[PDB]
Amino acid sequence: LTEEEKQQILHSEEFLSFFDHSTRIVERALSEQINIKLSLNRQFFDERWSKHRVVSCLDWSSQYPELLVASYNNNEDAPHEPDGVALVWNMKYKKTTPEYVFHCQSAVMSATFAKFHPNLVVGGTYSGQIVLWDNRSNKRTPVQRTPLSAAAHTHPVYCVNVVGTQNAHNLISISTDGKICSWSLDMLSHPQDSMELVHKQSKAVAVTSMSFPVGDVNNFVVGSEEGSVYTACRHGSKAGISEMFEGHQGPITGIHCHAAVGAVDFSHLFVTSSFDWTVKLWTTKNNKPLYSFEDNADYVYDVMWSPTHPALFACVDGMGRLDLWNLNNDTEVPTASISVEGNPALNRVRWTHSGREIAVGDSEGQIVIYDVGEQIAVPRNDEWARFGRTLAEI
Amino acid sequence: LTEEEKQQILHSEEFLSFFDHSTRIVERALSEQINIKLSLNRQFFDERWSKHRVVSCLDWSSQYPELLVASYNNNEDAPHEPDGVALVWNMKYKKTTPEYVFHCQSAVMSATFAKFHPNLVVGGTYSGQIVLWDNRSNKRTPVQRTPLSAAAHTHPVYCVNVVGTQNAHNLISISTDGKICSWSLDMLSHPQDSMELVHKQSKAVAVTSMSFPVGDVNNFVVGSEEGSVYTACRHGSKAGISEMFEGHQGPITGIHCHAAVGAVDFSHLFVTSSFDWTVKLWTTKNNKPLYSFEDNADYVYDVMWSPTHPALFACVDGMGRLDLWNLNNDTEVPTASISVEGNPALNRVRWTHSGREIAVGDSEGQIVIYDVGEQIAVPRNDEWARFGRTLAEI
Amino acid sequence: EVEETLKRLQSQKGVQGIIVVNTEGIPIKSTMDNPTTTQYASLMHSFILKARSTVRDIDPQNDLTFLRIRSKKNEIMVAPDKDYFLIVIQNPT
Amino acid sequence: EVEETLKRLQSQKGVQGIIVVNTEGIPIKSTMDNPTTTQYASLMHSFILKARSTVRDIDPQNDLTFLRIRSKKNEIMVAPDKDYFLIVIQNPT
Amino acid sequence: FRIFSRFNALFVRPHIRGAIREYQTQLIQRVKDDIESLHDKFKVQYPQSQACKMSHVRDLPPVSGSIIWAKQIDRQLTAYMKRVEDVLGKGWENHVEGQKLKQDGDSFRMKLNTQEIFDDWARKVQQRNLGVSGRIFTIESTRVRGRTGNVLKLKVNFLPEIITLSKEVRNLKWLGFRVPLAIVNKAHQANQLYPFAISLIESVRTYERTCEKVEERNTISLLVAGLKKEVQALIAEGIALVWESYKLDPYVQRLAETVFNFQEKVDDLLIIEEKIDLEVRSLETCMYDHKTFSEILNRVQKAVDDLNLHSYSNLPIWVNKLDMEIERILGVRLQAGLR
Amino acid sequence: FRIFSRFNALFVRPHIRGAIREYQTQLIQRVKDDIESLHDKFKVQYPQS
């Protein structure tokens, strides 16, 4: 009768593949196969990693369009417990439990998947230290960490992304100070590129969020907490701010370029969600906003296009309501709307890849995903033509 | 016990419990989840049997799509060395040597796989004897050999093919003199049927290629050495040539009916490959060559329809360029076109029955297995309609 | 209807109709190669019987109808009623 | 980790009892008592060794990575890879 | 108002204007009710609204956050006023309802002033007199709970909150509020100097953590003593410096790289150390055989050689003590075997 | 051949005809000595082609 060999083999941690397959399979075992317009689909609220915790960012994995990453700042509930909380959440089979967890010693501000590698997850923190994490390996610590140096990011980083293809990739990050930095996925300890974005008279731009024209690398677009939107080329013949936009009165919070691609070219359309309920749509060739979204006041955070429909997008209000806003059918009234129960301060919204459903973050951490009407999800050539003519409206 | 009481117990009517059991287990087991361009594909070049000895014909085994018959004909280096050699080369595993080797007394001028016998290779030689090769036997010598009598072929036979159902076969072969003959695959001692192809009274046909349209076995198309393609009826009151085609002012070097099915029929179409770089997209119902792809200084040697794409077809050349013509995509420039190294006069093309990969002949014996791009190989469901429209263009 | 059962079963992925094995290890229904399926069903019958003994050791009131032998190649669904033991080969995908 | 593993594997359904077994049968851990855990897990280990032999019969390269039996009274779980043998006591539903 | 924005083409012709003045009173009352709702929302003070904590998540310093929130509320109120002015036509104030509404809006806007908080914050900044000038970092005395002695813990003379002030200015400057030139200078200097300070503080914290980890395992400090000496020398060189200088960047950079190299070599030495210790413990109970003993010793010697090729410090005495322990355990094992 | 075959019925226009082949007569020279390169094959190949 063994008494220590079992105890020591339990103490010895060779359970990596053990725990991996056990977790990936037991939630599968949760299935009950016993032989004897908007609509909520799946409400996810982790009790252990999201009690009174604010959603910081959201992302859907293009490589695996069932895998989501969500962030969190430090938890005011308990400082001693881990502060930077990162959750990887799944859509294989229903389960209250998150599929993966991740911790960072610093509060996590933004996160995303890597396009170069379909398993790595990269996230910017509050200390301005980019954090790498390996999904397949079972660990809590960051796998890699960019140095905290004058050359590297030092102010809190709020947007990070991967550009290029899977053999021409490049990880671009923005610090709110105005630093752009380009890293590689194979090494996360030295900036391959880095420069301090400057608009004029050498003053920097307090960048809050950034996006890029779909299907294109370089020639980036950034939003500033000063309330001004800029277009700045990454390398070109000259890096730095290329164009300053008349912009919105308050801070520009959620910026996104158009993404749907079809019979027409609309990759120059920008949606910006400022701090005045104002979801502004414009085009890069015109300095003035093309339209204004106004139904209330006070802070719609983020706006995001639907990758499949060309004239349809989402924007979530801090008042606690998500309205799906269409352009081809309407210009003043949301074609769809819903409110998360409890009326919570909904922070972030993310269209899932291929669309057909949406993900929403919350101040409480209860992220909710749910689909859209079929009659509203799917576009058609009519949608593109009428969208072109509605742009021609003014 | 034995297999009779089981029948009655099945006929017994206590199966309601068993039926409910099966229904429950099947309906519960229904849900399923997971647990967690032109390219040189390969080479095939013997050295013992492939010193010079240009390629003559190629084929893929329908039953074993991993097998390719070669037929290396000319002996000029050493009269003492074997005169005609046939090589069969496998696809599943890469080897520097053919899987089996066959040597025929004469020079083998065409070859193919037998359908009924999946263990047999039959070829026509220059002398005029149809020659067997049973791969069961360990003798490189031909197993069964047709006589060189007036009844059988007495001229260089260049076209052999076994067709019919698995229970109704006929090894057809037509020689340069033009005498068609069918044999039973198992009995080649005597020509079970023969008839000398003749055009308008007292006009023999210097036949040099044939192709049976897919499905049909009674009527087919033949390409003469005199540039004039004909259509003949294998069996019937009108048995023999039934059409006179203007064709091209050069000898025909290849012919092939259409090789696709599933949508609106195209079997009336067939491409010929002439001797002045003039491949002729063209149909039986009409009499004028529908179109006349031309370019180059040299001239084609073989052309084959894609087994899966109802537009694509290959095209050899004497300068060593192989070009795939995708008619729907374009009708003037080769959709794909690359030259094998060393600019040797390629002499044969045989698409794999899968249609995903192409072979090519060679003037020195190095058979090259080319792969093709996915977008350039697989047609779409819309592809057939586009082909119909393009044909309707003129 | 036996034929209705066969057509319903063959609709499942990687399943060739319905094959039923009695308590003798010989499949009352024939759908695959006889020797391989017979020996396979015999080993099936043996280990399901020892599983029945194993469960009755501590569960003298339970009955066996569900078992998921899944590998990285295929899963075999084995379901005994009292004499007819359905064996179903299905792809894990 | 140890305690977190069992805690999370258990509260997912309010599982009656699971103990971590990294050895070939005969576990000294317990969740509701020593006997019903140890002897039953040893019986499971003996049975799954035979099941592994069974899956290796059709082809020796096959190995069993996942096993469940859902009967009228219990649902038994084990996912062996090299020594990691699971036990789950749970309602049939 | 969307409904009217649909139709504006003969508002010049005063035939439709009769309808708009017919519902004019209902329009005015409903707008007043909406403004009342907005004012009620405003009455929820900024710290009591989730907008404050969220803007904190949004890197908005709370004073700047409240100021900008109030300014946006004012902007929305002005939007209501002008949009009513446009729809109803010129001079809606002339109506008793119009003048009452305009008085209500002006009073609300007066309650919605913003400069006073700006003034108070500036005064508080000036009174508190934030600064960074001084020593590169400060050494202080703290009696950490757990030990009787007074721990001279090493800190950095840099308040992490100073950058917050910078951000406030970096916001308030573009908000149109002008801040005193001394405050601009202090904030600018703090902003430009922040990266050096944060690199320094992270480096020193990492060094403290790794050194306490080392001394947690006394068996290894003797080897790492050289790296500790060079780090202490670098700190000694740095500390004499005043807070602002021109060697700050090179010194900070070399300190950071040295600390990082120190920490990584520390962890490598640590892991190889428990490897060797575990193998020694196994040798303690290893069964009596020349082959197994030889293999254990071979692996230990290979690990020692691996340390040697890394060119660490202080190897010989460490090897000597290890060999002494090995021979003592060997003597015990030989005793057992002999008896 | 194809690139001007796109015109075919275009250059019947009074101005297109002047727009074609007056500017390109030199490239007609160029295709001529392309023909020269063509006969190059014919020049020395007869029995060893």
UniProtKB/Swiss-Prot annotation, chains A, B:
Record annotation: effect of changing P289A: In NEDMIBA; likely benign; can rescue neurodevelopmental defects in zebrafish morphants
Compartments where found: Cytoplasm, Cytoskeleton; Cytoplasm
WD repeats: from-to residues: 50-99, 103-143, 152-193, 202-242, 247-292, 295-335, 341-380
Keyword flag ATP-binding: no
Source superkingdom: Eukaryota
Keyword Nucleotidyltransferase part of the UniProt annotation: no
Post-translational modification: Pyrophosphorylation by 5-diphosphoinositol pentakisphosphate (5-IP7) promotes interaction with DCTN1. Serine pyrophosphorylation is achieved by Mg(2+)-dependent, but enzyme independent transfer of a beta-phosphate from a inositol pyrophosphate to a pre-phosphorylated serine residue.
A GO MF label: microtubule motor activity
Gene Ontology terms: biological process: microtubule-based movement; transport along microtubule
Keyword terms: Acetylation, Cytoplasm, Cytoskeleton, Disease variant, Dynein, Host-virus interaction, Intellectual disability, Microtubule, Motor protein, Phosphoprotein, Repeat, Transport, WD repeat
GO-annotated cellular components: centrosome; cytoplasm; cytoplasmic dynein complex; cytosol; dynein complex; microtubule; vesicle
Residue stretches in coiled coil: none
Disease cited in the entry: Neurodevelopmental disorder with microcephaly and structural brain anomalies: An autosomal recessive neurodevelopmental disorder characterized by global developmental delay, severe intellectual disability, microcephaly, dysmorphic facial features, and cerebral malformations including simplification of cerebral gyration, agenesis of the corpus callosum, and brainstem and white matter hypoplasia.
Family that this chain belongs to: Belongs to the dynein intermediate chain family.
Protein name in UniProt: Cytoplasmic dynein 1 intermediate chain 2
Source organism phylogeny: Eukaryota, Metazoa, Chordata, Craniata, Vertebrata
Gene of this entry: DYNC1I2
Coverage span on the entire protein: 208 to 621 of 638
From Swiss-Prot, chains C, D:
Pfam hit, one: Robl_LC7
Family annotation (SUPFAM superfamilies): Roadblock/LC7 domain
Function: Acts as one of several non-catalytic accessory components of the cytoplasmic dynein 1 complex that are thought to be involved in linking dynein to cargos and to adapter proteins that regulate dynein function. Cytoplasmic dynein 1 acts as a motor for the intracellular retrograde motility of vesicles and organelles along microtubules.
GO molecular function list: dynein intermediate chain binding; identical protein binding; microtubule motor activity
Organ and tissue specificity: High expression in heart, liver, brain and pancreas; moderate in placenta, skeletal muscle and kidney; low in lung, prostate, testis, small intestine and colon. Isoform 1 expression is up-regulated in 64% hepatocellular carcinoma (HCC) patients.
UniProt similarity note: Belongs to the GAMAD family.
Name of protein: Dynein light chain roadblock-type 1
Recorded GO CC terms: centrosome; ciliary tip; cilium; cytoplasm; cytoplasmic dynein complex; dynein complex; membrane; microtubule
Subcellular location: Cytoplasm, Cytoskeleton
Superkingdom, taxonomy of origin: Eukaryota
Predominant subcellular localization, coarse grouping: cytoplasm
InterPro entries in alphabetical order: DYNLRB1/2 (IPR016561), Roadblock/LAMTOR2_dom (IPR004942)
Keyword Calcium: no
Subunit and partners: Homodimer. The cytoplasmic dynein 1 complex consists of two catalytic heavy chains (HCs) and a number of non-catalytic subunits presented by intermediate chains (ICs), light intermediate chains (LICs) and light chains (LCs); the composition seems to vary in respect to the IC, LIC and LC composition. The heavy chain homodimer serves as a scaffold for the probable homodimeric assembly of the respective non-catalytic subunits. The ICs and LICs bind directly to the HC dimer and the LCs assemble on the IC dimer. Interacts with DYNLRB2. Interacts with DYNC1I1 and DYNC1I2.
Gene Ontology biological process terms from the UniProt entry: microtubule-based movement; visual behavior
Keywords, sorted A to Z: Acetylation, Cytoplasm, Cytoskeleton, Dynein, Microtubule, Motor protein, Transport
Swiss-Prot record, chain E:
Effect on the protein of changing I3L: In SMALED1; disrupts dynein complex stability and function
Region (Interaction with DYNC1LI2): 70-221
Localization: Cytoplasm, Cytoskeleton
Signal peptide residues on this chain, from the entry's feature table: none
Disease: Charcot-Marie-Tooth disease, axonal, type 2O: An axonal form of Charcot-Marie-Tooth disease, a disorder of the peripheral nervous system, characterized by progressive weakness and atrophy, initially of the peroneal muscles and later of the distal muscles of the arms. Charcot-Marie-Tooth disease is classified in two main groups on the basis of electrophysiologic properties and histopathology: primary peripheral demyelinating neuropathies (designated CMT1 when they are dominantly inherited) and primary peripheral axonal neuropathies (CMT2). Cortical dysplasia, complex, with other brain malformations 13: An autosomal dominant disorder characterized by global developmental delay with impaired intellectual development. Some patients show signs of peripheral neuropathy, such as abnormal gait and hyporeflexia. CDCBM13 is associated with variable neuronal migration defects resulting in cortical malformations.
Protein family according to the UniProt entry: Belongs to the dynein heavy chain family.
Comment block on domains: Dynein heavy chains probably consist of an N-terminal stem (which binds cargo and interacts with other dynein components), and the head or motor domain. The motor contains six tandemly-linked AAA domains in the head, which form a ring. A stalk-like structure (formed by two of the coiled coil domains) protrudes between AAA 4 and AAA 5 and terminates in a microtubule-binding site. A seventh domain may also contribute to this ring; it is not clear whether the N-terminus or the C-terminus forms this extra domain.
UniProt protein name: Cytoplasmic dynein 1 heavy chain 1
Shown part of the complete sequence: 582 to 920 of 4646
